[PDB]
């Protein structure tokens, strides 16, 4: 008796994390079922970099990681290697040698409310870009001008986060999209197929 990876808890989770605070789940010591991944739902994006989906069953990985977050459709093109933008630079950056998969699906029926669902946030400004798989969760005000800021919001001092006003009538590009990135570590390997 050897349990299976908790992929349903990741994909079929009731609520997803904000992109700035993307959630991560380590997947070790299990036997993964990738068949249930494809045809259990309809995804609007399924792209794998450096790995083959037919050979996933025939490969054994040491440490798998399932990152999850929510963004708008327009930004789904930033969850890939060597991409730039607000999401790729200040929220979730994937390395150039990414060896994994990126899945994403529309979620306007859960993550958008009439009048705007402002619970999902994203970072606008940082002093620097995010290293690959780095998470910044700080809420210190951003110094956007020559005048330093003293923990008080004001002229040229802005809060680093902003809310996605996800409405059910928005355009498909501005609608919420749940994203799941499967990273594959290679190094005793406790994951298989």
């Amino acid at each position, epitope marked *: 008796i050897t349990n299976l990876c908790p992929f349903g808890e990741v994909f079929n989770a009731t609520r997803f*994390a*904000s992109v700035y*605070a993307w959630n991560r789940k380590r997947i070790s010591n299990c036997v993964a079922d990738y068949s249930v991944l494809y045809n259990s739902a309809s995804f609007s994006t399924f792209k794998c970099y450096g790995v083959s989906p037919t050979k996933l069953n025939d490969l054994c990985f040491t440490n798998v990681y399932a990152d999850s977050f929510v963004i708008r459709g327009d930004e789904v093109r930033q969850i890939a290697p060597g991409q730039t933008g607000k999401i790729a630079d200040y929220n979730y950056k994937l390395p150039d040698d990414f060896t994994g998969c990126v899945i994403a699906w529309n979620s306007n029926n859960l993550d958008s409310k009439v009048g*705007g669902n*402002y*619970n*999902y*946030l994203y970072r606008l400004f940082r002093k620097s870009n995010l290293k690959p798989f780095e998470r910044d*969760i*700080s*809420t*210190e005000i951003y110094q956007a001008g020559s005048t330093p800021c*003293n*923990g*008080v*919001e004001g002229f040229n001092c802005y*809060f680093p*986060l*902003q*809310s*996605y*006003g996800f409405q059910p009538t928005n355009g498909v590009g501005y609608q919420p999209y749940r994203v799941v990135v499967l990273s594959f570590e290679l190094l005793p390997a406790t994951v298989c197929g």
Partner: nanobody, 121 residues
Framework: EVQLVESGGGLVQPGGSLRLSCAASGRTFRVNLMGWFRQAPGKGRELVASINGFDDITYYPDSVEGRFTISRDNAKRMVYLQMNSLRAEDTAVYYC??????????????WGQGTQVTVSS
């Protein structure tokens, strides 16, 4: 309107502990993320802790991380800050901050009156 009413917080002994609470009343916030601030006499307003209520994610600045902790009670609209091993440096006024969003999405901040806490021998 909105009003953050802060209770708890008085006089403590160095090395002691203390729990502050803050209760919001008024219009429900478009976002669930709050924080505590600390203004010492002769210093600027400092960030002590911030909690995201939509998520289970907390943020503490490097000044005080392993000593203070922030929690929330969503049903009661309460937010708490427990401080342990309090030192004389911690003497200050602690303020409540409830963040909201405008139609544009830019986040602003509602403030509470603040409660004073002093750590003297």
């Amino acid at each position: 309107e909105v009003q953050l009413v802060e209770s708890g917080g008085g006089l403590v002994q160095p090395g002691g502990s203390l729990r502050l609470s803050c209760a919001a009343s008024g219009r429900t916030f478009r976002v669930n993320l709050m924080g505590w601030f600390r203004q010492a006499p002769g210093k600027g307003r400092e960030l002590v802790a911030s909690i995201n209520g939509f998520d289970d994610i907390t943020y503490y600045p490097d000044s005080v991380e392993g000593r203070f902790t922030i929690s929330r009670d969503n049903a009661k609209r309460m937010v708490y800050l427990q401080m342990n091993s309090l030192r004389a440096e911690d003497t200050a006024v602690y303020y409540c901050a409830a963040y909201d969003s405008d139609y544009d999405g830019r986040l602003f901040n509602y403030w509470g009156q603040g409660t004073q806490v002093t750590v003297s021998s």
